[PDB]
Design a protein around this nucleic acid. Structure first.
Ligand SMILES: [Mg+2]
Ligand SMILES: [Mg+2]
Ligand SMILES: [Mg+2]
Ligand SMILES: [Zn+2]
Lengths: 102, 249, 77, 64, 129, 225
RNA sequence: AGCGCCGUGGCGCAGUGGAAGCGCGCAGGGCUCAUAACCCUGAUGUCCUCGGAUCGAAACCGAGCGGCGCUACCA
RNA sequence: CUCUAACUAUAAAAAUCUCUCUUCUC
């Protein structure tokens, strides 16, 4: 049966999309159905920001961050907890799940 | 008393390879005695136990046997041995086996005196072990050289000579070669008899009409080869003139 | 010599006059069983197939090279 | 060497581990009270106790 | 400058066997190549933070012996074709370098990243663990 | 951490005792002329240290070479050419962005504009220059995005191409670096392209050397002093 | 008729120089609702006999014993 | 009726399965 109106792909008018390889399982997958997470992260955690700070010349450093855009597959994503199997009536809500940190 | 460690000092060195004997297993791993170094207990942890995954433990340790392993860290203060079984090279396993067998032979050799003359085994082994292990290699080569020409036991004075005489009493290589006679001469048996009379006066015997097999009881592994080639060249020199031909391969 | 026996099932004693992998090829399909060529050092060369099909093994050994059927004494087991 | 360290727990961070017996604790060292570190401890714990550490460099994460 | 001896830590942190390999500013002359696997016995906890921490401490001791006090860290992952993601050990190695006396400056992310090169390993359906 | 197969298909010496330190001096255009120190093997003829040194590259943040923090995201490469003794003189080699700022300003909902150009400088240096620009929300937006039409990218890209062509072919690498320090060329590009589209945060990326005339000893001597 | 191997627990190896050695086997038990798989404990003997050295020997050797490969029937 | 910030990290192995299926109006 029609599980999702958008076919769970989000292509709808492109015919074919360039495949991309999963970060973990290395599966080729259409770039739109290639669930994507902007892993923007500080290069060290708060448990070491101090340790680095007092061991730092150039007081009050900018502490540069590391950015990445993880292109998961879907099998790894569902297994590695990125995406969760939600209920039928809750599928149609495409907003991010309510401000991860508030 | 099986005691008095094989090598220079009682306490094992660092990262050194051993073979060990298993006695018991409490719950974590096994603290088991050693017959490569002094009998102080060395303990193996299950994390470092089996190359295969841990599902059966009584079949891979086989309590009461000899197993190759390597000691990681040593406690020389009051005596604890951290001992590891996995990170051993497939080519160094042969090294462990041969070294353990060599030390076993040394233990077997220097027990006969201690039990025949009821003197301390530790004292006698301490006296003997200075020219024994540290000269340039293992004891067995020195003992073989001494039985063929006594020069090692005289390096240092033993407690007496009766014990060394008992050692000599207890202690008290064949090389093959084929010679094929391709002779078409008329009288070629007399040449064979003459050449073998000259060569034998070490052991040359018969197999087939052209095949003569010499099994020399050499004592140096290189003297036998040179006597072998001398006999071969004597055969050729005697046989190529009277009318025949012989070949050795 | 050249004795052949079947023991619950491995076949010990196999003439070399035909290649072994084709023997396995015909064996697996005509028996429908897991097949193994185990070469233990200097024992009768081991060909192992599962199940109790000694009559079917008789059929195969007839159909591969066998024409004697007189030195085959399969142990029941 | 005897670099034994002491640390007083200020907050109990629930309980971690598949066994369900090990506690994450946020301990501030008695020496250098300005610094805090989170570590795993096996056995009953309550805030206000003072605990002993052989190593203080290791940061302890969840025990999976 | 305060009469300092600058260096570069340039940690390489894969998902196995974190690397710590300090060199000079020119980048050619290497100091304290000791890695994570150097200081752990399992050959499989090499990626664990303990290996990186002990490696970093030994590097710090060597640096104090050779005079290099302040460092310019270049954090690296395997990157390129492989996962573009920093390993867990390298961060702990960086922290251990921070603790043991040495000073830091201009920590850098030097992850090698491709512009879609290298049709890479895995096959169509990829890993099937 | 013990032994291995050792498929060989003591005699150890100390690494540092036979080693020696050298100083690096920056071009006079840079603010903090003293850069740092580099490790060398001890000087022995027949492969003197001079042969090993000339050609090396030193990798230093621009904020270090100026002092202020506004130059944190930039990062200059310097090429070792001349050895004076206990101190070596280095000519300009290249200049680049730190990957962090680049990855930070490449966001969604604003397409980028890249402009590559290969240009001879005033004297003889063949160089390559990249320019990175990002579309800007005007401060009245209610449309949540700022895409630019490929005609606008064509115009902006061409304009940057001639801008860099002029600014490199006219003045030498020293004067080039003089314009590079206070990023006057960036604001120049922003002004010259202001009529096409807002174009937030233009910048010069990966000033890459390609070719150098012979050595020009006098140029190096004038550079450092 | 010679020299080299085998020398049994129902079996092939295994060390041969501290004394009962591994797996295959077979019996029982464990696992599971049950079976296969997996996990444990077992009874099997003259490692053929003679000696020597040997505190200690099946082993290290030696002087006969049952079968295997060659010489090739070695008038 | 003025509001655009914070983050972590697991994939060991696991095969098979007999009957006997039928009844709602006051
Ligand atoms: Mg369905
Ligand atoms: Mg989707
Ligand atoms: Mg799966
Ligand atoms: Zn995946």
């Amino acid at each position: 049966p029609k599980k999702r109106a958008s076919n769970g792909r989000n292509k709808k008018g492109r015919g074919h999309v360039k495949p991309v390889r999963c970060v973990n399982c290395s599966r080729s997958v259409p770039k739109d159905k290639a669930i994507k997470r902007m892993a923007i992260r500080n290069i060290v955690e708060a448990a070491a920001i101090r340790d680095l700070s007092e061991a730092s010349v150039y007081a009050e450093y900018a502490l540069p961050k590391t950015y990445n855009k993880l292109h998961y597959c879907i099998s790894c994503a569902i297994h590695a907890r990125i995406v969760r199997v939600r209920s039928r009536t809750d599928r149609r809500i495409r907003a991010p799940p309510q401000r991860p940190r508030f | 008393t099986s005691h008095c460690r094989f090598y220079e000092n009682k306490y094992p060195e660092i990262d050194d390879i051993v073979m060990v004997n298993v006695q018991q297993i409490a719950e974590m791993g096994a603290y088991v005695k050693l017959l490569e170094y002094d009998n102080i207990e060395g303990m193996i942890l299950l994390s470092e136990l089996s190359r295969r995954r841990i599902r059966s433990i009584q079949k891979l340790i086989r309590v009461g046997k000899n197993d190759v392993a390597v000691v990681l860290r040593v406690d020389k203060e009051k005596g604890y041995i951290d001992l590891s079984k996995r990170r051993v090279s497939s080519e160094d396993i042969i090294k462990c086996e041969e070294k353990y067998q060599k030390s076993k032979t040394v233990h077997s050799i220097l027990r006969y005196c201690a039990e025949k003359f009821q003197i301390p085994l530790e004292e006698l082994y301490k006296t003997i072990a200075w020219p024994l292990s540290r000269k340039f290699g293992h004891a067995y080569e020195a003992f073989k050289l001494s039985i063929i020409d006594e020069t090692v036991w005289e390096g240092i004075e033993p407690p007496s000579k009766d014990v060394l005489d008992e050692l000599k009493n207890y202690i008290s290589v064949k090389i093959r070669a084929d010679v094929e006679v391709s002779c078409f001469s008329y009288e070629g048996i007399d040449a064979i008899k003459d050449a073998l009379k000259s060569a034998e006066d070490v052991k040359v015997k018969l197999v087939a009409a052209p095949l003569y097999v010499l099994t020399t009881q050499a004592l140096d592994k290189q003297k036998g080869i040179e006597q072998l080639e001398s006999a071969i060249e004597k055969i050729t020199e005697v046989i190529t003139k009277y009318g025949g031909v012989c070949n050795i391969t | 010599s050249n004795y052949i026996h079947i023991r619950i099932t491995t076949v010990q004693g196999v003439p070399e006059e035909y290649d072994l992998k084709r023997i396995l090829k015909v064996l697996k399909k005509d028996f429908a069983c897991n097949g193994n060529i185990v070469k233990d050092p200097e024992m009768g060369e081991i060909i192992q197939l599962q199940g109790d099909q000694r009559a079917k093994v008789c059929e195969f050994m007839i159909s591969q090279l066998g024409l004697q059927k007189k030195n085959i004494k399969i142990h029941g087991f | 060497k005897t670099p034994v360290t002491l640390a007083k727990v200020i907050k109990v961070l629930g309980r971690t581990g598949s066994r369900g017996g090990v506690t994450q604790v946020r301990v501030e060292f008695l020496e250098d009270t300005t610094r805090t570190i989170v570590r795993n401890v096996k056995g009953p714990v309550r805030e206000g106790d003072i605990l002993v550490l052989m190593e203080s460099e290791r940061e302890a994460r969840r025990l999976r | 400058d305060n009469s300092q001896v600058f260096g570069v830590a340039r940690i390489f942190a894969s998902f196995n066997d974190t690397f710590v390999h300090v060199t000079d500013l020119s980048g050619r002359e290497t100091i304290a190549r000791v890695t994570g696997g150097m200081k752990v016995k399992a050959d499989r906890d090499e990626s664990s933070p303990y290996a990186a921490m002990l490696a970093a401490q030994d590097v710090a001791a060597k640096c104090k012996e050779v005079g290099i006090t302040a460092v310019h860290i270049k954090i690296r992952a395997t990157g390129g074709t492989r996962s573009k993601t920093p390993g867990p050990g390298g961060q702990a190695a960086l922290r251990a370098l921070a603790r043991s006396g040495l000073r830091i400056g201009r920590i850098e992310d030097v992850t090698p990243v491709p512009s879609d090169s290298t049709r890479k390993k895995g096959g169509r359906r990829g890993r099937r663990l | 951490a013990v032994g291995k197969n050792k498929r060989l298909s003591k005699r150890v010496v100390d690494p540092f005792t036979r080693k020696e330190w050298y100083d690096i001096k920056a071009p006079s255009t840079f603010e903090n002329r003293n850069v740092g120190k580099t490790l060398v093997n001890k000087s022995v003829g027949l492969k003197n240290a001079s042969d090993s040194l000339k050609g090396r590259v030193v990798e230093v943040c621009l904020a270090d070479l100026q002092g202020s923090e506004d130059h944190s995201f930039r990062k200059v490469k310097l090429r070792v050419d001349e050895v004076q003794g206990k101190n070596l003189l280095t000519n300009f080699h290249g200049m680049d962005f730190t990957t962090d700022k680049l990855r930070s300003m490449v966001r969604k909902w604003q397409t980028l504009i890249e402009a590559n150009v290969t240009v001879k400088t005033s004297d003889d240096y063949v160089l390559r220059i990249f320019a990175i620009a990002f579309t800007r929300k005007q401060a009245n937006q209610v449309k949540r995005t700022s895409y630019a039409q490929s005609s606008h990218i064509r115009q902006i890209r061409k304009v940057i191409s001639e801008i860099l062509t002029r600014e490199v072919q006219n003045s030498t690498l020293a004067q080039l670096t003089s314009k590079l320090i206070p990023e006057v060329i960036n604001k120049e590009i922003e002004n010259a392209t202001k009529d096409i589209f807002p174009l937030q945060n233009v910048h010069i990326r990966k000033v890459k050397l390609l070719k150098q005339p012979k050595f020009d000893l006098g140029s190096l001597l004038s550079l450092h002093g």
